Amino acid sequence: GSHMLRWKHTSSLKVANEPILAFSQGSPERDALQKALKDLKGQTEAIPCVVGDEEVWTSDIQYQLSPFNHAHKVAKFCYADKALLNRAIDAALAARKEWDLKPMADRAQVFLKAADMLSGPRRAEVLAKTMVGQGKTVIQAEIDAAAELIDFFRFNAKFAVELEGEQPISVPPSTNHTVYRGLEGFVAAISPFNFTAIGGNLAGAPALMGNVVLWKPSDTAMLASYAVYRILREAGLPPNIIQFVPADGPTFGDTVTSSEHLCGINFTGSVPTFKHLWRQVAQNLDRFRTFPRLAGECGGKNFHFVHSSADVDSVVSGTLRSAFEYGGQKCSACSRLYVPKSLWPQIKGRLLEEHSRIKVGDPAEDFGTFFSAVIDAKAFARIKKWLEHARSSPSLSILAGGQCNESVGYYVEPCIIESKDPQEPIMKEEIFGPVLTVYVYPDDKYRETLKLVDSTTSYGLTGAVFAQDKAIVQEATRMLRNAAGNFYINDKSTGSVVGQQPFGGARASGTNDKPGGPHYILRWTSPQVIKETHKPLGDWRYSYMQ
Amino acid sequence: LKVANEPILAFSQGSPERDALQKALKDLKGQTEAIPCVVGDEEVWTSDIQYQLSPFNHAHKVAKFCYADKALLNRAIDAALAARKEWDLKPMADRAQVFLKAADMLSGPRRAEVLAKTMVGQGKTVIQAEIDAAAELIDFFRFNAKFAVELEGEQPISVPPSTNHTVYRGLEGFVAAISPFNFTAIGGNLAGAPALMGNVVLWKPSDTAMLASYAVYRILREAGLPPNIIQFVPADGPTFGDTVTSSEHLCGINFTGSVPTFKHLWRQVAQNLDRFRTFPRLAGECGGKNFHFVHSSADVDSVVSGTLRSAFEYGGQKCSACSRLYVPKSLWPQIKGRLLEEHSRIKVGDPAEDFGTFFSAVIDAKAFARIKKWLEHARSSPSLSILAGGQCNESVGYYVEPCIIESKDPQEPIMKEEIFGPVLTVYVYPDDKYRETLKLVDSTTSYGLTGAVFAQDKAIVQEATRMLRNAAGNFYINDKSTGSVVGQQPFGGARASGTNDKPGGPHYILRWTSPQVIKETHKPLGDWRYSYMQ
């Protein structure tokens, strides 16, 4: 009764979060970052599409601009045409079986090696490219392009290696084993401008699980995205496993959703784009060899809710960070603040005072900068329209900021607005700019106002409650259960850390597959269970039939 | 929570279980149950009266039920939504208790009832009802309860001065559970697993499995399931799909059935995306065109008994049933002779009256008609030859004899299309073309559900396993392609066969939770500035 299939013991991996560096004066990391920033000043990188190991140029030339100095073209790249995208698909599919058959531990090694490169010798590079290309300050680049990306790679490797140890029960005369197959076909990874790490995860997590990927990075994050790609290849990712294919968005979506071999879309960005892709897949359902898996994390209209028992200083600092870091360009950024009347004079005074101290400027040249320009001309225009709405709306008053200037960079000052109307459109719609709206509620209506927090918007991403009263915290936690997939008690609504706050939310905010947690990788495997029986079968009849 | 598989009973003469089953069968002979829709605790009748017939004696109406209209379905949604928050807030263990109690009831005092209702209402024999309505259903309930309670123990890293905790929220909205005729247990799982995870559910059972489905429902309610957590709402299929996909509160569809129906629901959801409060989650397990592939080194007796069981048990009405057998020329005289001899001994008849019955009538007139079309095709096609069987008679029951067909064309439509009847097609390949034929096993059909290789050569088994990696989500070496057991062979497959969420394994329940992570910080936050800025 010898076993013809033999299964090897599965190993474990010890990982921990990547430490955040301090960038203190004279420190090696501060010196290295300054050098890398100097290396990028006045430079434009010509970034090709990469299919297999071939650098390919099309005639559709595009430029990435430095948000705080838009005269500086930080990258010249090109959009893959439909022909090149289809060639990339074919090549990826031809490489898939071998990659899928590789031991999980061997695929994981690529990402572990990449993580170590990012941690050490390439840290300054990816930080600097994120600063110059996406407009991040030192610490915003550090938490993103270094820590979060490194953590995705290490933690997902751990989760994936350990997943193979999740095996079914065997009873004589049979042995059962689960094979965690990659998905059959190719995955389209479509990433947003605002986090370098998200691009790496969107393309990298499916690849880890044995998939092949067409990665269309965000135009406005091209420089750092390519840096990450090159690191993966240097770390040993074989050719045709991730195709680096910048492209016109609609063109890319049209092409991948037209392929019979599409098996997944891993998306992060706006709701309408995700819905469009979902509908395109549904329209073409009959052509696909299998049912494609769509993962999408989208926007939020996130709240900080203050109870009268709150620590005022914590409300102020936490809210300033959440609303204004990276110019409020986070899916998790606080954009609505609910304050009880009893605390409003104290909080208003402190917000206005601290507001006056916030420095907006060039993050490469002035490390005193709290945040810099927003990402591009389109973002600037949208934010400007909202500022104009605030000035025109009788229910809205600008308390601080309101200025903007796109002469050199896409600069918008932090803006604090008070709304007398808790249902004003500005309380509902995601601006993705440094624009905080405050609604002041009477203390005696806190319960009713909690219902407003829950019902006002279509989103369910992040939210915080500031309160020191335990009963109130318990009550608010119950009431806001579905208002936030990442919920915070006495901390700011941003800054989720891999393995500590797995990230995502529902309602209109996406599919909530919790990248950063141990279950995310399951979306990118389609398990097979093998049963081997070690003894001859008996008769087809059963004894009870006699 | 520690859990083991429910024993499969032998039903020997004089055994407690055989005596109890015979009594339960006697209790049901000549009976018609009037089965209402159940919304909350309200038993509701509409004018749209329907009947479930006994497949092997269709003059016997085993149940009278009714279709919920759009208005009733919408009231059921409203009532379920109003009950959801409290249920979702209940500790996982408290919800699990309902299913553990239900499992104990099914194992013991209600075992004979659910078996008998599955036999009389769906046409199963004793052992097919036993592995389904008892063992599989009990196992779904016990194993999913274990998986769910243990999932709560999966928690994130906390680092001072913050504590992090994951709350495994149910999905916000209601889940539509749409179950098939062929397994009583699948209905229980499709409605039960989401409910376990804090969801509320509109369950539309299969018309042709109504009697046993309602029995399961009542057991859940008696086991402590509160009102409005699972609504028991038989309905016309299209009416149900239209109604649930039209609700802004739809958050999931848990489906098992045909590919076209699942695709239709998928498209309806996509059409209505802008109306939904969140993105609904669709889970669908659909059909298969499953293979048994034989290498020349195979144990012939195992091939023969395993294939007869896989192809013909429950009339081949399994998503996992073998319908294409590939045999090397060198073994064909043996396998052909044995299949045809054993075929002559297969008893098709009344499973309640004759425990000697191997399998009974197919489920309904529509299935009978579809299968007859395939038999007529086999008589027409120049590449197909009926080797044994081919008879069918719907005068008393929907009776189809087991049929064995040889195809000279490995790509014939009968080798590709799911028949869901007791119809086995055999392709004989030259021994030296074994690798080419393995490739054909993989490339011929659109499906990826189950398959088996029979071989006693290690290198061949290893090669075949690698080559057929995506041809079967449940793959078997030297065993039949049916009969997955919860916790041992989590079940499902890809290609056209569905979403492959592996019910019966530890990860299935994750489709029915939308986690929230709570971070609590225990010290004041300090300045908004950072040190490097100074």
Ligand SMILES: NC(=O)c1ccc[n+]([C@@H]2O[C@H](COP(=O)([O-])OP(=O)(O)OC[C@H]3O[C@@H](n4cnc5c(N)ncnc54)[C@H](O)[C@@H]3O)[C@@H](O)[C@H]2O)c1
């Ligand atoms: N929930 C999260 O984890 C998360 C994280 C980051 C950003 N976001 C969200 O992303 C949004 C801002 O980012 P954005 O500007 O890049 O959004 P966006 O939808 O405009 O673009 C996102 C990506 O989709 C691409 N794209 C656009 N149309 C496409 C199409 N038809 N087919 C294929 N790809 C297409 C873009 O080129 C880009 O790469 C915000 O709503 C923000 O909240 C969410």
Ligand SMILES: NC(=O)c1ccc[n+]([C@@H]2O[C@H](COP(=O)([O-])OP(=O)(O)OC[C@H]3O[C@@H](n4cnc5c(N)ncnc54)[C@H](O)[C@@H]3O)[C@@H](O)[C@H]2O)c1
């Ligand atoms: N992969 C698996 O695990 C698995 C298990 C059991 C059965 N099946 C498959 O089920 C199929 C046969 O079962 P079937 O006869 O019930 O198929 P079916 O798709 O016609 O019906 C299944 C269910 O869907 C309902 N239905 C039909 N149209 C609907 C609509 N528009 N909206 C909502 N509900 C609708 C039916 O009433 C029934 O309850 C086979 O293909 C078989 O392979 C698969």
